[PDB]
Design a protein around this ligand. Structure first.
Ligand SMILES: [Mg+2]
Ligand SMILES: [Mg+2]
Ligand SMILES: [Mg+2]
Ligand SMILES: [Mg+2]
Ligand SMILES: [Mg+2]
Ligand SMILES: [Mg+2]
Ligand SMILES: [Mg+2]
Lengths: 79, 50, 116, 136, 178
RNA sequence: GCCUGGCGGCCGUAGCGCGGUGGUCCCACCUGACCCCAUGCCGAACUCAGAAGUGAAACGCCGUAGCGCCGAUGGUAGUGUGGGGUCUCCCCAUGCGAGAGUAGGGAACUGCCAGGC
RNA sequence: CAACCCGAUGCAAACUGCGAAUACCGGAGAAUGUUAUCACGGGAGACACACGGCGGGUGCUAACGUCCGUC
RNA sequence: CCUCCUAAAGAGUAACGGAGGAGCACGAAGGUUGGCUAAUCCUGGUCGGACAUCAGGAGGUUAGUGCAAUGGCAUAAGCCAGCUUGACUGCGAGCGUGACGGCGCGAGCAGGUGCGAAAGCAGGUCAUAGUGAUCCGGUGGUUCUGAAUGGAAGGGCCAUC
């Protein structure tokens, strides 16, 4: 009674954990809702509407911490 | 609802047009705002919006 | 604090600048003085500099911060940052309302030849 | 009566225990009851035991109850079908485990508290023991 | 700078020996009067506000700053906007010039004044007292004026203690009461 | 090398507090304000032309453990594989091994340019 | 008669200023494995599962109960 | 259809399990440029008291967020104002997520816009709900077709109800 329902999939997480093939624009992190769980940085950025961490130019993924008070900050150099 | 589907028209002699909605209930003033007209390939004034 | 204020104001562009990996030309200002120095993208090493504090300009000048007293420094920076082969840089008004002394030296260095 | 005056949710899950309580060494009195066993106190019990203590100490002495229910624990009516929505809350139990400081006495002789908690553990599912303040 | 000059001149040194301050750049100065005149009510009338405005703009040499509502959940009622007054701080020159029309033509232009408070002080050392009723001073047609008034006034000095806050003001012609 | 400014590194053992300390070099307040440019009021802020004044505030140093913060050794909790007891729990072999807390640490350490000595 | 706050003790699926084992994703390496792996195409059957172990919701940590995960 | 727990620290997973929301709202509540920063308490102040506005101090995302919840937000995603219509058109490297039908993210390219001195930002809103396939038709456009030929009806195509 009045108890049930539920959203659905909405994966939103790391799909390009650490270094990877890193194509012109994979994802490496689609953890929506977030902006601080994974901050836009490095050769890549994007951070689309749903905050999905873009991932520009091809290369390797990094996953840093640089910046006052934690602050993840995903960056991707060239591999 | 209360939001009618409004349609913006080009001031140009072309039939091209845009589409959206408006709250006529409180905005009985026909809207205009200028948009791109593919036909004339030039940004012009678009009108009609209850 | 007044200082702590300006900082955060420029902290923005000073981020979209680093991100752009572009070479910015900082322009610090003060009641009795005007500064300007071109720092590398890494923001660690400086490339050029021309401040009213330098006698080379302070003497031939009139009053450090006399507006055109800044413009002098403005072009001055351009001078150095040009023979060095440096050109085409982003201006970092650094929280300073681009309009007075900062406006000067800027368009000044701009007119001096700098590309921006 | 001895339950939380409020709570975010009316019904908590089932979960389970894993022995070794946290609050061990008495930090309020000089005696008290120890866990020594696993289990959960139906509160009403801890209250039924509390009365025993008093009705022995007579008066003189301060008592403590480091244990607390806080756990809902539902139940389903008599002749009622199965799985039709989590049953409604019935009582309130208190999850305890080995090494739990049930109660605490001080303002009374060690010979009293002793034969005071013995009348307490009387009404208790868990087998409790006696303890002292101890420097540590 | 009439009273202003008096400060640096007569005052200052007076405190420099009565407080034995090390540097002149310490002696508590006059840090702008604030004023306010919380029109409150407004809601229904609203006009009593614009009236209070001019009635305020009259006193202060500047322009009234009609305020809004912070809480918007006033016990009474009040919404987010709901105007309630007009602070209107003072500016150096006009400020001291106001410190003139006041203390010399304000408190003096009494109603039954027989001594000013000495506890209008604060912690850091800032006095602020409400006239309780606009003394009808140089206002639009003194008699041909709007129904009553009444407002507040805060000095807020650069003193570090109310104690020292006494020297200032008292160093001038602050009516007070002793 | 002493001190100061701009720009970064790293982002609490880099902070907070309490005390002392620094000057017309810089910085800071500070003077003036028709003006450029400003105030839902204000030359407060922003902005301009600049003395006279001063380190008071802010700030920069140095000292100081009261508060943050870093923090083991050891032990405890948990746990992957193999095995055993058994009431829902737990033990053993074996690798991994916290959190808290204890000893202790700790009053940042740095690079580029410039300016005073 | 008591909030708040100070110190001392606990509790949490929908608490977290901490935080594993571990699983997973990727990179490189040796050996082993009668390509185990991927794509495409011909033929399917199968979409009632049961128990035992471990983690659990529900149930009474009842049921040779029920519902997921996993072997 | 959306949010959280169950869910065992990647994704994903059941029940007549435990909880709460959506069927919209905004021409500004969008874009941009410029600027700002709370809640709460203490002290002092006309009418002002529990709390209207004013002043100072402590405090520090405990405020705020159009509407649930979770995540996020100070370089503010929060607040105010000027100017505006990028809530543009055509495309799209490359990815995520689905049995499929689909759905989502998207740098960059061409045309043209707006805001800014400029770097630059803008392809609707802090993000995730706010929704209906196909058919059959209706309306506008188009030298695509049109049954002897020229038209036309009708059909296609694009926009759309
Ligand atoms: Mg079937
Ligand atoms: Mg089946
Ligand atoms: Mg099954
Ligand atoms: Mg079965
Ligand atoms: Mg998961
Ligand atoms: Mg897992
Ligand atoms: Mg939103």
């Amino acid at each position: 009674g009045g108890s049930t329902r539920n959203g659905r999939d909405s994966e939103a997480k790391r799909l390009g954990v650490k270094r990877f093939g890193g194509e012109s624009v994979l994802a490496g992190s689609i953890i929506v809702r977030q902006r601080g769980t994974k901050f836009h940085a490095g050769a890549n950025v994007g951070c689309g509407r749903d905050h999905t961490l873009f991932a520009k130019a091809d290369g390797k993924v990094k996953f840093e911490v640089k910046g006052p008070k934690n602050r993840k900050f995903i960056s991707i150099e060239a591999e | 609802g209360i939001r009618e589907k409004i349609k913006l028209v080009s001031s140009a002699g072309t039939g091209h047009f845009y589409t959206t909605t408006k709250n006529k209930r409180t905005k009985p003033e026909k809207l205009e705002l200028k948009k791109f007209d593919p036909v004339v390939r030039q940004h012009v004034i678009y009108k009609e919006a209850k | 604090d007044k200082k702590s204020a300006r900082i955060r104001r420029a902290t923005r562009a000073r981020r979209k600048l680093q991100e752009l990996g572009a070479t910015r030309l900082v322009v610090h200002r003060t009641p009795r003085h005007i500064y300007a120095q071109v720092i590398a993208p890494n923001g660690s090493e400086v490339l050029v500099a021309a401040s009213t504090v330098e006698k080379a300009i302070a003497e031939q000048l009139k009053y450090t911060g006399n507006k055109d007293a800044a413009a002098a420094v403005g072009k001055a920076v351009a001078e150095r940052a040009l023979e060095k082969g440096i050109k085409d840089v982003s201006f970092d008004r650094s929280g300073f309302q681009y309009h007075g002394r900062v406006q000067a030296l800027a368009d000044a260095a701009r007119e001096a030849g700098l590309q921006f | 009566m001895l339950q939380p005056k409020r709570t975010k949710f009316r019904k908590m899950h089932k979960g389970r225990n894993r022995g070794l309580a946290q609050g061990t060494d008495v930090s309020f009195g000089s005696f008290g009851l120890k866990a020594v066993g696993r289990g959960r106190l139906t509160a009403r019990q801890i209250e039924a035991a509390r009365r025993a203590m008093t009705r022995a100490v007579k008066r003189q002495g301060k008592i403590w109850i480091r244990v607390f229910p806080d756990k809902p624990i539902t139940e389903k009516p008599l002749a009622v079908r199965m799985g039709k929505g989590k049953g409604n809350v019935e009582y309130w139990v208190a999850l305890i485990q080995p090494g739990k400081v049930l109660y605490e006495m001080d303002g009374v002789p060690e010979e009293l508290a002793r034969e005071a908690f013995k009348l307490a553990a009387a009404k208790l599912p868990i087998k409790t023991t006696f303890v002292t303040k101890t420097v540590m | 700078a009439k009273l202003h000059d008096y400060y640096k001149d007569e005052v200052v040194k007076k405190l420099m020996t009565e407080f034995n301050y090390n540097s002149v750049m310490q002696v508590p100065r006059v840090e702008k009067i604030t004023l306010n005149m919380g029109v409150g009510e407004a809601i229904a009338d609203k006009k009593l506000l614009d009236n209070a405005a001019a009635d305020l703009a009259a006193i202060s040499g500047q322009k009234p700053l009609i305020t809004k509502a912070r809480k918007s959940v006033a016990g009474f009622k009040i919404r987010q906007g709901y105007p309630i007054g007009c602070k209107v701080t003072l500016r150096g020159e006009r400020m001291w010039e106001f410190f003139e029309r006041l203390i010399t033509i304000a408190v003096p232009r009494i109603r039954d004044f027989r001594g000013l408070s000495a506890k209008s002080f604060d912690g850091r050392g800032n006095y602020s007292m409400g006239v309780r009723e606009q003394i009808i001073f140089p206002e639009i047609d003194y008699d041909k004026v709007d129904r009553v008034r009444g407002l507040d006034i805060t000095i807020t000095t650069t003193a570090k203690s109310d104690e020292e806050g006494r020297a200032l003001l008292a160093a001038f012609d602050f009516p007070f009461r002793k």
